Every structure is written in structure tokens, then in C-alpha cells.
Design a protein around this ligand. Structure first.
Ligand code: SAH
Ligand code: DMX
Ligand code: ZN
Length: 641
């Protein structure tokens, strides 16, 4: 049900620019065939709601074969097609297109001559466009067919960016000690690693221009012509360019466009604002955004001195290299780190201001003879604790991979004999794991790799409860407490991904709305969704409010904690959602927020996902929220009152 509830179908239906341009392209394509005195037979691969096939019949198509692999959506399409009056000219086929056949016992009577698809993701080819088009041309469509879109072009732009490069590399981490400044350096293999072999998809329009320096023009790397045989074979494309500035080549930004017609008059583009002529004409969507790729190593370029950028791809994946000045399987992570820390986590560890804030917290609670246990996955806190004068430091790493990575970091920093790594689930550690000692300081960020919602990091509190018997009398916990906070917001655009459409370009899509509604209301309580709100502008309509408080210095209570209240809407706007986040009381006079950092538009901690509870799809919002200690779940309802 959750796959349906949080699918991208609703966003597509609200994507006005997408739907307008497809409709224009489809009318032109169908007319080109009819004007030749020929039968117009449409193959619509990945039909979803059936929208593009319905467009095709209004344009004059004789018949459409609409293919949809996902059974619940194929069933929806059948109903939607019927509601809109097109059942006589559209056959919905619930198969993957590569299983579709032409023949007396087949799905199609003959090859089609108009090929419509919307099989694209942010990387263009990451959801199988190439092998799908390849098979279609081989078996399902005529030579010289019309295609909508007619072609796609992938673009790339080389930049220097400390912020985005910090999602890929570990920078030196500084800490001030009694003896002076200490530095934590990365293992050399991290410095030499090509990184994780996966795109980083983001709303690139929300990255400040101050965060990167453009080093190249926007380069058209390669194009795919959907009207002719498409190949899914590996390929590489080398494009020469003259650097626009001197700097460190680090990051390749990328996006694509599609042309709906042979003449290229009708275009949809994912280019970010600085690569378009007018930011006021920018079109928002979420189902397609932009790409961030990393070069396998950084290196200098010089303004005016030509180089060649190379786009590599296989049947699903794209990656980049900078050709040698003189002068292929995709490289994989050989340093462990990129398999364990995701891109935002890299950025978080590299936030020196954040690190300094934890350092000052530790200075406050690090008493003489402190015996520290550190609990948080892949955390550098154990190293800060040592450098700041802990008598003995233990840390827990519950996976063998993370255990090895942290030991490696400790060893290259000559701390192998100062920090003991315990390879167990933290709640299961033993007296002997602590060498028979009692813990006087239990510390954490808290951060755990598996946490998906902000309150999942309350696992730290669970661990605190489980290891109580290993704590010294008067033991201190850092953070000493945590709290759940909420604010009501109006989203600029994000509301589109969960709002009903009703009518799309004249077609009745209420059945799609009903289907989504049924899935997100399956449970008695609707769940909040995690989103990185630094990528999604919104403004507050209420004051922020503390919802629940958790005293880490004490064990978790065995009864559920419930809170009820009201949040006054103090500013005008549409109440799209309640946004929730965690704050941590590190010490009596130190706090940190993983959500709102300007309690204009909201400003959000860029390292963390916030939780969004969308409201029913009016100047007070009431809430009921409950924390369940057996599971760690938090259930909630927010409603206008
Ligand atoms: N090779 C394939 N054969 C059949 N369905 C496919 C497919 N590849 C992807 N899909 C389906 O293609 C759809 C892509 S979303 C596009 C939906 C629709 N054409 C529209 O534009 O409104 C999804 O529902 C997915 O399940
Ligand atoms: C769900 N638990 C059993 C722990 C499991 C968390 S894990 O996914 O990090 O393994 C109980 C729990 C209890 C209180 C807080 C948080 C979790
Ligand atoms: Zn790596």
C-alpha cells in the first residue's frame, strides 16, 4: 500500500508543462500519420493512468496498445479509460513491454507506428528506457515510426564545489585540545576512491550559486533518437571544452531534455535556473529533478586550457571522467566509506561548525577519569572524546563493515590503542566488553544508519536503558534529553506530490485520486513522510511548538507517552502540512536542531530529513501524538480545527 501511497503518479498529473508538451507532441505525431492516409496505431509503453493513450485517441488515433507492468495501475487504467469513454480504442495490457508479442496468440495484431513512452527518471535511463526502446524497435513498432518524445539529450556541466564535494570526500576534522589543535585525517584510500557508483539526485535549483563555481559551459554529451533503433549497449562520449575559470574539477552536474517532435519545437527540460534564460519561467516537478555526479578524482583545470569531459553509460547507469591531458567498467567503492555513509551523512560529518558544537558539549561533561561509551553508527565522537581528555573510550559498531572502517580511521590517526570498538548490537554489550569498568559518560549524536524518520534516533535512548547496569553512579548522558517539535507550513510546490488532481487536461482522473486516498488511509493512523526540506521551500503558518520531551538521563518509561494540543495559525496561507523534527539538549546550556534553524521561508538543517505530515486534502491545527516504547514508533494526527 505504501508503494502506491508514495508513488509519483500524483506529481505527474500536476506536472502541467509535462502534460501540455506531451499533448502537443501527440497531436502532431498522430496528425503526421493520418495526413498520409494511414492507420495510426499507438504503442504506449508504461501507460500508468492511461493519460497519453487517451490524448492519442482525441488526436485521431485508430487504436492504442497501452502497456503497464504494475498490476494495480493497469487495473486503474482500465477503469480510467472506461470512465473517459475510450474503451473502444484502448487495450490495456498488464505485462512488461519486453514480454509483449505480435501474433495470432499475441497481445498486438501487428507492429505499431506511433511510439509513446514516459519511461524516464532523473538520470534519463535509470528505469530501463534503453532496453525497453530497444526491444520495442526490434519487435513491436514499424520502421520509420513516429515517436513521442522524438529524442532526448543529456547535458553536463563541470563545477568546483566544496559543499557538494563534501558529500563524497571526508575532509580533515579539526579539534582544539589542551596541547593545541589536533587533526583527524581520512584514510588515504578514501581520498583515492571513485565513490559510490550511483547518482545523487537533488532539486539543484535550491543549491545556492555561492556553493559552486562553474568550470565549463553546459555540454551536450549525447542524444537518444527514439524514432530509430535504440541500443542498450555500453558507450562513451567525449566532449572537448575550454574551462571558463581556473579551479578544482570535482563535480559534474547533469540533466536532460526531451523533444516531442522531429523539428524540436516542443521541448521539456530539466535544466536548472542558471542554465535557462528566465528563472520566472522555471517549471517545478519532483518525479524528475537533476543529477550530481562525482569525478573519480579531483584535479585542477586552467581557464583557457582545453580538456575533454567523458560521459560513460551502460544499459542503466551513467558516470563521468575527465580525459587525461595527454591522454571501461564503472569504478566501485574500495574504501568502505561510500557503502556505509550516504551523501547527506558525509556532508554532516564534514560540517566543522557542527563538530565544534559537539566538541564544546564534550568539554562541559568530560570530568577527570571519564569512562566513555559512544553509541552512534560511524561517529567521530569517540575521537573527540579521546582528544578532549577521556580516560578511556569505548565505541560500538554493529556491522563488520562499519567496525573495520572505524578501526581504519582510528589506525591512520594513531588512535588504535585508545579507542576500543565493540562489534555487537549496542543494547547487548556486556561487562567484559567494557573491561569490567563502569561507564561515567554515555554519549552519541545520536545517529544510526537505518533511521528513516527523525525519532528513529531515539534508539540511543533504548540503548541507554538497556545498558543501565553498566553505568556508574551519577553517570551522565550526552545528549541529556531530546524533544519532538512541529510547525504548520505552506509549501511552495511540494504539496503537489500528494494532492488530488481530479481533472488532467480535460480527462477525469478521480479514480487515480481515490486509489491514492485508499492506500494512505489504509492504516488507522497516517504516517509522516521523510523529506530533505532544504530542497523544498516552505514558510511557517504557526509558531513552532514542542510536542514531546524525552529525558535521556532516565530509562524509557514502559507506558506510551501521549501529547495533545493546538497550534494557532498566526500567518495567512494554506496549511499544507505539519513538519516535525528532533532537537537535542546536549548539555544544560547547549542544544542542536535537526529541523528548523530559523525559529520569509523556513530554513532547515541541510544534513537531516524532516518529517512531513500532510493535512487533509481554518485558523487552528489540533494534534494528538503518541510515542510507543516497545516499538519506538510515534503515531500522530494533525487536523484543522
Ligand atoms: N517496460 C515497461 N513496460 C510496461 N510498463 C512499464 C515499463 N517500464 C516502466 N513501466 C511502467 O511505466 C510507468 C511510468 S510513469 C508514466 C505513466 C504515464 N505514461 C504518464 O505519463 O502519465 C509506470 O507505471 C511503470 O510501472
Ligand atoms: C525497535 N526497537 C526494538 C529497537 C530497534 C531499533 S533499530 O532498527 O536501530 O534496530 C525498540 C525501540 C524502543 C525505543 C526507541 C527506539 C526503538
Ligand atoms: Zn569509497
Amino acid at each position: 500500500h505504501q508503494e502506491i501511497a508514495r508513488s509519483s503518479y500524483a506529481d505527474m498529473l500536476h506536472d502541467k508543462d509535462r502534460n501540455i508538451k506531451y499533448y502537443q507532441g501527440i497531436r502532431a505525431a498522430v496528425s503526421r500519420v493520418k495526413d498520409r492516409g494511414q492507420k495510426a496505431l499507438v504503442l504506449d509503453i508504461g501507460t500508468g493512468t492511461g493519460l497519453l493513450s487517451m490524448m492519442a485517441v482525441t488526436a485521431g488515433a485508430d487504436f492504442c496498445y497501452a502497456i503497464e507492468v504494475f498490476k494495480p495501475m493497469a487495473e486503474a487504467a482500465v477503469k480510467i479509460v472506461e470512465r473517459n469513454g475510450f474503451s473502444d480504442k484502448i487495450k490495456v495490457i498488464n505485462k512488461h513491454s519486453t514480454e509483449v508479442t505480435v501474433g495470432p496468440d499475441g497481445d498486438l495484431p501487428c507492429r505499431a507506428n506511433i511510439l509513446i513512452t514516459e519511461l524516464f527518471d532523473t538520470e534519463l535511463i535509470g528505469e530501463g528506457a534503453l532496453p525497453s526502446y530497444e526491444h520495442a524497435h526490434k519487435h513491436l513498432v514499424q520502421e520509420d515510426c513516429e515517436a513521442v518524445p522524438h529524442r532526448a539529450t543529456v547535458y553536463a556541466q563541470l563545477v568546483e564545489s566544496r559543499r557538494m564535494w563534501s558529500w563524497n570526500k571526508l575532509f580533515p576534522v579539526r579539534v582544539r585540545t589542551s596541547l593545541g589543535e589536533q587533526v583527524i585525517v581520512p584514510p588515504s584510500e578514501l581520498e583515492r576512491c571513485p565513490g559510490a557508483p550511483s547518482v545523487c539526485d537533488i532539486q539543484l535549483n535550491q543549491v545556492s550559486p555561492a556553493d559552486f563555481t562553474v568550470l565549463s559551459d553546459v555540454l551536450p554529451m549525447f542524444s537518444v533518437d527514439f524514432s530509430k533503433q535504440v541500443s542498450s549497449s555500453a558507450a562513451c562520449h567525449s566532449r572537448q571544452f575550454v574551462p571558463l575559470a581556473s579551479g578544482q574539477a570535482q563535480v559534474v552536474l547533469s540533466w536532460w531534455d526531451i523533444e516531442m517532435d522531429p523539428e524540436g519545437k516542443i521541448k521539456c527540460t530539466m535544466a536548472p535556473f542558471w542554465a535557462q534564460t528566465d528563472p520566472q519561467e522555471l517549471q517545478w516537478r519532483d518525479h524528475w529533478m537533476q543529477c550530481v555526479y562525482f569525478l573519480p578524482q579531483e584535479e585542477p583545470v586552467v581557464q583557457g586550457s582545453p580538456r575533454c569531459l567523458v560521459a560513460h553509460h551502460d544499459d542503466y547507469c551513467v558516470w563521468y571522467s575527465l580525459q587525461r591531458t595527454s591522454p571501461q567498467v564503472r569504478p566501485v567503492c574500495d574504501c568502505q566509506a561510500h557503502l556505509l555513509w550516504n551523501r547527506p551523512r558525509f556532508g554532516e560529518i564534514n560540517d566543522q561548525d557542527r563538530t565544534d558544537h559537539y566538541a564544546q558539549a564534550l568539554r562541559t561533561v568530560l570530568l577527570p577519569g571519564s569512562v566513555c561509551l559512544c553509541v552512534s553508527d560511524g561517529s567521530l565522537l569517540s575521537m573527540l572524546a579521546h582528544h578532549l581528555g577521556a580516560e578511556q573510550v569505548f565505541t560500538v559498531e554493529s556491522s563488520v563493515a562499519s567496525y573495520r572502517l572505524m578501526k581504519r580511521i582510528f589506525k591512520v590517526n594513531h588512535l588504535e590503542d585508545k579507542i576500543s570498538v565493540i562489534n555487537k548490537r549496542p543494547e547487548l554489550l556486556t561487562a567484559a566488553d567494557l573491561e569490567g569498568k563502569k561507564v561515567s559518560l554515555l554519549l552519541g549524536e545520536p545517529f544510526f544508519t537505518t533511521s528513516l524518520l527523525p525519532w528513529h534516533n531515539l534508539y540511543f535512548w533504548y540503548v541507554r536503558t538497556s545498558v543501565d547496569q553498566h553505568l556508574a553512579p551519577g553517570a551522565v548522558v550526552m545528549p541529556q534529553a531530546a524533544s519532538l517539535h512541529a510547525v504548520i507550513v505552506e509549501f511552495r510546490d511540494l504539496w503537489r506530490i500528494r494532492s488530488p488532481c481530479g481533472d488532467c487536461e480535460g480527462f477525469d482522473v478521480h479514480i487515480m485520486d481515490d486509489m491514492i486516498k485508499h492506500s494512505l488511509d489504509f492504516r488507522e493512523s497516517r504516517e509522516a513522510e521523510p523529506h530533505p526540506l532544504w530542497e523544498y521551500p516552505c514558510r511557517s503558518l504557526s509558531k513552532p511548538q514542542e510536542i514531546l520531551t524525552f529525558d535521556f538521563q532516565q530509562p524509557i518509561p514502559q507506558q506510551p507517552m501521549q501529547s495533545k494540543g493546538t497550534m494557532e495559525l498566526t500567518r495567512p496561507g494554506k496549511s499544507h502540512g505539519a513538519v516535525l523534527w528532533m532537537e537535542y539538549q546536549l548539555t544544560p546550556d547547549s542544544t542542536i536542531s535537526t529541523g528548523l534553524i530559523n525559529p520569509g521561508d523556513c530554513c532547515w538543517n541541510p544534513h537531516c530529513k524532516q518529517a512531513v505530515y500532510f493535512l487533509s486534502t481554518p485558523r487552528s491545527v489540533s494534534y494528538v501524538v503518541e510515542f510507543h516504547p516497545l516499538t519506538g514508533d510515534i503515531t500522530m494526527e494533525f487536523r484543522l480545527a
